[PDB]
Enzyme design. Structure first.
Site, mmCIF file in Angstrom:
data_model
loop_
_atom_site.group_PDB
_atom_site.id
_atom_site.type_symbol
_atom_site.label_atom_id
_atom_site.label_comp_id
_atom_site.label_asym_id
_atom_site.label_seq_id
_atom_site.Cartn_x
_atom_site.Cartn_y
_atom_site.Cartn_z
ATOM 1 N N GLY B 31 0.803 -1.207 0.000
ATOM 2 C CA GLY B 31 0.000 0.000 0.000
ATOM 3 C C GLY B 31 0.839 1.261 0.000
ATOM 4 N N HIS B 47 10.413 5.931 5.184
ATOM 5 C CA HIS B 47 10.947 5.076 4.121
ATOM 6 C C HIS B 47 10.255 5.344 2.782
ATOM 7 C CE1 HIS B 47 11.414 0.898 2.197
ATOM 8 N NE2 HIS B 47 12.642 1.367 2.283
ATOM 9 N N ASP B 89 16.722 1.868 2.305
ATOM 10 C CA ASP B 89 16.406 0.577 2.903
ATOM 11 C C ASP B 89 17.165 0.370 4.207
ATOM 12 O OD1 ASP B 89 14.772 0.191 0.757
ATOM 13 O OD2 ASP B 89 16.062 -1.296 -0.236
#
Lengths: 122, 122
Positions: B31, B47, B89
């Protein structure tokens, strides 16, 4: 969308969809396709091939209408792509339920998905 | 790619990444973004904001190289975009680790994600 897909799988299988199928085998959940591990994995193979044929809507994002009638998933009229999408999702949810009998937890979290054997063309 | 991201999260948190963060809150995993449920959720919010800065590479599918040096994620070689992606990441993996103290299982499988309150601009 993913919401409807996840919901259908819950309705048909009675299982937490992300937990049971989010990273299952070489075809279920995240990532693309690969040589199927088992019957459950093959359900997801077919499903992703189904998504490939779709034009006009986005399978991951686009919402569609469907109902739960006499414990059956009934796709609303929607439009061409959304109805084809609804039927893709219904078919995999049904398939996953029909293969619960061979569902195997050893495939549930396959973080080796990128290294699966290449799948045949849809 | 998702594989590198998943691996980093495992290395920093010691947790099954898809299990713990695949559907957590309004921002982690599948999502888009939404109003964060907690500190863990806000890690994922940041992020996804970080991802929007990216030009040239595909965060879900593009591989990059990194290494594990003195129990630290060290982003390797990589062009300008992949370097940024790797650092995005790495940042979220570290953040998730730092907020394990408030990780809440009730947010773990948030299938109400499509109904999260709208996220503010990044």
């Amino acid at each position: 969308s993913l919401f409807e897909l996840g919901k259908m799988i819950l309705q048909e299988t009675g299982k937490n969809p992300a937990k049971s199928y989010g990273v299952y085998g070489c075809n279920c959940g995240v990532g693309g396709r690969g040589k199927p591990k088992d019957a459950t994995d093959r359900c997801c193979y077919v499903h992703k091939c189904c998504y490939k044929k779709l034009t006009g809507c986005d399978p991951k994002k686009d919402r569609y209408s469907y109902s739960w009638k006499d414990k059956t998933i009934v796709c609303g009229e929607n439009n061409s792509c959304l109805k084809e999408l609804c039927e893709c999702d219904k078919a995999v949810a049904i398939c996953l339920r029909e293969n619960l009998d061979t569902y195997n937890k050893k495939y549930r979290y396959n973080y080796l998905k990128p290294f699966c054997k290449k799948a045949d063309p849809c």
